Amino acid sequence: EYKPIKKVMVANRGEIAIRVFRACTELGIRTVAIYSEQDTGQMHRQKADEAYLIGRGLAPVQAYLHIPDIIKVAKENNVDAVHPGYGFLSERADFAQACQDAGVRFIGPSPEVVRKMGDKVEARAIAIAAGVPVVPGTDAPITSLHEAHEFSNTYGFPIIFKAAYGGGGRGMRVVHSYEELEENYTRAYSEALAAFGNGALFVEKFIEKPRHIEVQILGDQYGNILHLYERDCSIQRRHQKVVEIAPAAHLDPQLRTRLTSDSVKLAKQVGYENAGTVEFLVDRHGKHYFIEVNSRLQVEHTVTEEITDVDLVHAQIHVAEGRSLPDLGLRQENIRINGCAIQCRVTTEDPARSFQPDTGRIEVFRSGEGMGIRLDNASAFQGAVISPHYDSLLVKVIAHGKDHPTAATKMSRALAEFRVRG
Amino acid sequence: QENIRINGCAIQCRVTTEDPARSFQPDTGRIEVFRSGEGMGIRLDNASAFQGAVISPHYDSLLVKVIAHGKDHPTAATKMSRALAEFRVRG
Amino acid sequence: HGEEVTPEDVLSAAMYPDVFAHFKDFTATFGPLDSLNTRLFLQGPKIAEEFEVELERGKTLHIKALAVSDLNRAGQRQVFFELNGQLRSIL
Amino acid sequence: HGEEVTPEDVLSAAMYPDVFAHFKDFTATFGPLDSLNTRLFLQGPKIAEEFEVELERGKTLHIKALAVSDLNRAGQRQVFFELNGQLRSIL
Ligand SMILES: CC(C)(COP(=O)(O)OP(=O)(O)OC[C@H]1O[C@@H](n2cnc3c(N)ncnc32)[C@H](O)[C@@H]1OP(=O)(O)O)[C@@H](O)C(=O)NCCC(=O)NCCS
Ligand SMILES: Nc1ncnc2c1ncn2[C@@H]1O[C@H](COP(=O)(O)OP(=O)(O)OP(=O)(O)O)[C@@H](O)[C@H]1O
């Protein structure tokens, strides 16, 4: 209904660039790509109409974080919209404001919603506002041993220290005693103050048997929100995702609908308006505990993309244009489940020593494509050099079948068919 | 019979070393560069296609069997068109 | 030859038909010239060094030279090149 | 260093621990042997010829020597061989 887009630029590298380029080429839209000086041999620039250099005199990882250079590139090439992908300025509220101030649309939520997300205090306050129960724990950050002692005494003995300044593991240590409690608190506080910025820590109970569920949220500019379905990715090496299962393994239907309704309600209250992710956490007796909200599109969206057979990037671009969901032909009564899917991430981590990253040169590469195998080649090709500056993802392999064991066997066959030497 | 259902639409094309201009006369030679075009709803059945491959003048002339799947006929056609444009088989 | 329309080439052929025909044949064969570095166009890439060639405002290519083979069967050496991330072999 | 021990291996360690250790480390480092002919084992293959290696009666794999590059950096040369139906490069 509103102004169409004629050209789109991406601010990431790797598989997301390829996926967005394919989606745009399906709609007859010109594509613009960016790259750094070190990242000159990748395959994500040959799949774009035009590619430009950025961060000429910067660090290999900080070249992709220079806002003014990206804005200047966007201005001179008559770019209409910019795609933030995931993990590259996607969760920075200032970048969205800069894009808006330059007349360029930003593919995603409004900067106000991004600022509301991010820090955990506002998210917890919003969640406790209506329904969506959260884990017991402190509201304000904790910096004292004594107050930690009262919160330990009140709720329960086993606790985990959760840090701020990074959603990552950080000091993810657990307390089962008091003698180790004091020294662990001292060590964690010292690490937070020294290696990190704010020494913000929280005292909360460690669920003994965690099992977390994700939900994909899609909404338009007219206040219509569509949830796709749930996911399970409980397999975690230490605190990072390993393997994802597209449908729920074994979930009560009442729990399914309750969690879906809670996710929709939370998305409505904040007034969310783009591809978004809502995470959860389930106990053995059954306790849905809210964790956080991801404002970007998640890397494990492909498995949800195949059960529903609804292209997420197409819908994202269309809703960026201004078209409403009913015009696209998307209703919560119109989509349905079809089969099962499994995703596995192929990396260069030695699975014996410490999952330590390995670097070198690829000498032999081969691929396996069958009935239910979808492949997303990021940077894997004959005679490729893997760099130690960026992520260590080679190929994202997805397997689809009519049942869980069938999909697992198909994925095992596909992995056996792969050959990576060197 | 009851457990079989229709879901979507599919299109089939065969990449062949035939010259559509003169008479669809088959051509022989050596492949110098090859690239794949896998995507969202793209299934690929590579018979014999790789760097430095040689096409026999006496056997069949099938290079790659490309299959595109979509929710509707125009969508499948668009996907197949973009997938064919990604394929680069020079020489 | 071709279906390109412009008066400038017609005029140029009017001054010189033969040189125009030769130049048109050369351009149709080897594609877009004058996008190279002068040293690159004059001597060619040095062994195992990465160079860069631009083609448009956004079209930029980085090519690496791998190796050159010897006469295989009919005096047709196989020269090995690398793309931005890929590798090439040419007869 | 052991992975296969049988009483005869214990017996060999009883007679010659040193050369047995050298043998096993050298062979496990450089893969299995006994599948190559004398030309292959003592001298090796040549460029521009196809030869055959029999590993086990189920399988037999073709090798062709394309070319070898020159040492560039880290003392890590790259050589281009083709296994039957593909092309390989080894560090
Ligand atoms: C350009 C196009 C219309 C015609 O391609 P073509 O006739 O085969 O050959 P062209 O010289 O005109 O351009 C394509 C070539 O330049 C390369 N190149 C293309 N876009 C590039 C870019 N932004 N930056 C750097 N290099 C690029 C391509 O890899 C291709 O090389 P190759 O086919 O020899 O391996 C189309 O094929 C194309 O390549 N579009 C860009 C990529 C694309 O369309 N992807 C579709 C899914 S995203
Ligand atoms: N109460 C809890 N009980 C058990 N495990 C927990 C609890 N809270 C957090 N965790 C674990 O620690 C992680 C904390 O996530 P955090 O936000 O710190 O990481 P992140 O950098 O955002 O990573 P990602 O968002 O990719 O999971 C959880 O993903 C989970 O594995």
Side-chain angles (χ1 to χ4, degrees):
Chain A
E1 293 83 3
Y2 282 31
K3 276 74 67 178
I5 301 154
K6 297 289 184 334
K7 187 176 284 188
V8 177
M9 191 185 48
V10 298
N12 293 49
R13 59 178 295 282
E15 190 276 331
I16 289 297
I18 313 291
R19 178 72 205 280
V20 177
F21 290 164
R22 297 181 168 135
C24 302
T25 308
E26 271 176 29
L27 302 167
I29 294 170
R30 294 274 287 180
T31 55
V32 173
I34 61 171
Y35 67 99
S36 56
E37 190 277 331
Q38 296 88 19
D39 198 273
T40 184
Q42 298 303 319
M43 182 179 72
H44 85 278
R45 56 182 290 240
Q46 278 85 22
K47 322 237 161 227
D49 294 330
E50 291 179 351
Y52 303 103
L53 212 142
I54 33 112
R56 246 124 329 216
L58 265 63
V61 65
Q62 291 138 35
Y64 285 85
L65 301 163
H66 203 277
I67 283 172
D69 208 339
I70 295 169
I71 289 296
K72 194 183 57 48
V73 175
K75 290 298 295 297
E76 311 325 299
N77 292 289
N78 302 118
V79 181
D80 207 327
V82 59
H83 194 276
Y86 95 101
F88 260 154
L89 251 28
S90 130
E91 316 282 89
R92 218 159 112 164
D94 65 27
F95 175 67
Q97 188 68 55
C99 294
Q100 178 171 290
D101 284 332
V104 189
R105 287 189 179 96
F106 185 83
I107 309 300
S110 70
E112 179 63 11
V113 177
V114 174
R115 209 208 48 68
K116 282 185 176 180
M117 295 298 102
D119 197 358
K120 274 72 68 178
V121 185
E122 314 97 333
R124 265 192 92 241
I126 290 157
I128 304 164
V132 59
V134 77
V135 293
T138 187
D139 291 339
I142 297 314
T143 55
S144 312
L145 190 42
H146 184 74
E147 65 182 1
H149 177 74
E150 292 83 4
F151 292 101
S152 176
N153 193 7
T154 293
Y155 290 135
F157 191 27
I159 63 172
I160 169 169
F161 283 20
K162 159 100 62 158
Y165 182 76
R170 239 117 226 105
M172 244 21 144
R173 291 194 146 89
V174 167
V175 169
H176 301 101
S177 63
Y178 63 93
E179 294 171 353
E180 299 173 345
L181 167 60
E182 294 100 24
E183 60 90 18
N184 279 320
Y185 153 80
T186 311
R187 186 270 323 153
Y189 186 74
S190 315
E191 287 298 323
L193 62 88
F196 309 116
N198 285 313
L201 294 174
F202 311 100
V203 162
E204 48 133 343
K205 2 242 284 121
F206 188 79
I207 311 293
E208 68 292 338
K209 290 238 170 198
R211 173 172 164 77
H212 64 304
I213 305 307
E214 272 169 298
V215 174
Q216 191 60 241
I217 284 293
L218 196 54
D220 63 357
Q221 272 167 29
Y222 292 68
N224 267 327
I225 297 170
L226 183 63
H227 76 93
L228 281 179
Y229 270 124
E230 320 162 337
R231 284 202 291 265
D232 176 336
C233 183
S234 295
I235 299 98
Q236 277 157 11
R237 162 91 166 79
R238 64 185 183 272
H239 294 270
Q240 313 165 342
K241 307 296 187 291
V242 192
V243 176
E244 315 87 339
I245 310 305
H250 283 287
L251 261 56
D252 293 331
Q254 55 271 51
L255 191 144
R256 292 238 295 169
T257 185
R258 151 190 299 147
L259 197 151
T260 285
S261 182
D262 290 332
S263 182
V264 164
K265 165 156 84 153
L266 191 148
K268 202 79 170 292
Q269 198 277 339
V270 73
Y272 192 70
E273 58 271 287
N274 225 263
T277 301
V278 181
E279 302 204 21
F280 263 87
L281 200 72
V282 179
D283 193 349
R284 297 285 74 78
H285 307 288
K287 313 276 155 190
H288 49 286
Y289 290 157
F290 165 70
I291 300 310
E292 57 169 301
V293 168
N294 265 334
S295 61
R296 83 216 167 262
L297 181 71
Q298 276 290 111
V299 71
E300 64 272 16
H301 72 295
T302 59
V303 294
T304 292
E305 183 178 1
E306 299 173 358
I307 310 304
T308 318
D309 206 349
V310 164
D311 196 349
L312 271 193
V313 191
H314 269 247
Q316 184 178 2
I317 277 171
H318 286 333
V319 76
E321 288 293 18
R323 268 189 278 177
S324 65
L325 291 203
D327 309 301
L328 295 173
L330 288 169
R331 299 130 184 278
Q332 199 191 131
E333 60 89 19
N334 216 334
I335 62 170
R336 33 182 67 81
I337 294 280
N338 205 279
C340 296
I342 294 181
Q343 202 216 53
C344 294
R345 185 139 54 263
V346 176
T347 60
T348 65
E349 316 263 20
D350 198 343
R353 65 181 65 252
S354 65
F355 267 39
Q356 202 94 0
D358 183 89
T359 62
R361 188 221 165 197
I362 303 175
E363 279 150 338
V364 160
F365 179 73
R366 207 137 73 235
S367 66
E369 48 273 18
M371 183 177 176
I373 297 294
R374 178 183 150 179
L375 189 151
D376 280 29
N377 186 358
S379 66
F381 46 90
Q382 184 65 75
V385 175
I386 178 67
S387 178
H389 311 113
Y390 301 118
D391 196 0
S392 58
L393 166 50
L394 271 181
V395 181
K396 176 192 296 207
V397 181
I398 306 100
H400 179 70
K402 50 190 195 54
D403 280 325
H404 186 28
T406 310
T409 309
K410 273 158 153 179
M411 178 92 87
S412 65
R413 199 266 302 154
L415 289 174
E417 193 178 352
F418 273 30
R419 201 63 39 77
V420 186
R421 304 281 184 182
Chain B
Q1 278 289 108
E2 51 276 10
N3 294 16
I4 282 163
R5 54 202 64 257
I6 297 169
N7 183 64
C9 293
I11 298 184
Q12 168 68 48
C13 294
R14 304 210 301 280
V15 176
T16 299
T17 180
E18 280 166 345
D19 269 8
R22 62 178 63 87
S23 64
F24 299 93
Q25 177 144 284
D27 191 5
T28 61
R30 173 185 179 270
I31 301 167
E32 291 175 0
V33 59
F34 178 76
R35 205 175 305 126
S36 84
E38 69 275 16
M40 189 206 167
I42 298 298
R43 182 183 149 182
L44 197 85
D45 282 28
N46 173 25
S48 63
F50 58 86
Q51 298 297 112
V54 185
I55 300 301
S56 69
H58 65 279
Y59 278 127
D60 189 358
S61 46
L62 196 46
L63 266 172
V64 178
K65 183 184 290 185
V66 176
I67 309 166
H69 177 62
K71 60 156 179 282
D72 284 312
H73 189 22
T75 314
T78 304
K79 263 166 203 196
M80 185 78 106
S81 308
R82 189 234 105 228
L84 273 184
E86 217 216 306
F87 278 121
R88 206 61 39 72
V89 220
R90 324 279 238 174
Chain C
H1 77 282
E3 297 295 327
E4 51 86 19
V5 183
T6 187
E8 307 160 352
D9 67 348
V10 176
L11 296 169
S12 63
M15 283 74 74
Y16 286 110
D18 56 355
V19 178
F20 178 80
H22 185 273
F23 160 83
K24 286 301 290 192
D25 291 331
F26 209 80
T27 52
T29 307
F30 290 157
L33 276 296
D34 58 21
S35 294
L36 298 175
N37 292 17
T38 294
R39 71 163 69 89
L40 177 58
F41 167 85
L42 283 186
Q43 284 316 311
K46 298 318 290 168
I47 297 89
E49 64 89 19
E50 182 265 355
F51 62 94
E52 175 270 323
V53 62
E54 79 296 328
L55 212 57
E56 195 259 333
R57 288 194 73 240
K59 302 281 190 208
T60 297
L61 297 182
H62 313 83
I63 299 299
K64 197 159 183 32
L66 177 63
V68 57
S69 78
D70 190 75
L71 286 73
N72 49 5
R73 78 289 185 275
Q76 213 196 36
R77 284 176 180 260
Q78 197 170 189
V79 193
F80 293 98
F81 284 106
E82 286 99 337
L83 187 153
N84 321 106
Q86 278 70 67
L87 177 63
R88 295 311 211 221
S89 71
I90 301 299
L91 289 173
Chain D
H1 84 282
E3 68 276 15
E4 81 274 6
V5 67
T6 53
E8 62 273 20
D9 312 288
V10 176
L11 188 153
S12 284
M15 64 183 73
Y16 287 100
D18 46 351
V19 305
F20 158 74
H22 192 293
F23 178 75
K24 178 64 72 172
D25 80 15
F26 194 93
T27 300
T29 295
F30 276 114
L33 274 299
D34 185 74
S35 303
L36 307 96
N37 189 358
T38 64
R39 316 174 190 274
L40 295 175
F41 182 76
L42 61 83
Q43 196 150 255
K46 298 316 294 173
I47 305 295
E49 58 89 18
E50 213 284 327
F51 69 96
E52 208 58 36
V53 168
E54 169 47 275
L55 277 296
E56 60 88 18
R57 185 201 161 251
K59 185 55 170 44
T60 293
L61 71 83
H62 302 281
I63 312 96
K64 178 67 173 65
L66 283 72
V68 55
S69 69
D70 199 307
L71 202 44
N72 49 9
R73 285 278 83 86
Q76 203 177 12
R77 215 147 183 180
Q78 188 178 185
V79 65
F80 318 97
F81 284 113
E82 70 91 21
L83 172 44
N84 53 339
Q86 198 167 19
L87 188 152
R88 308 285 208 82
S89 74
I90 298 284
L91 280 298

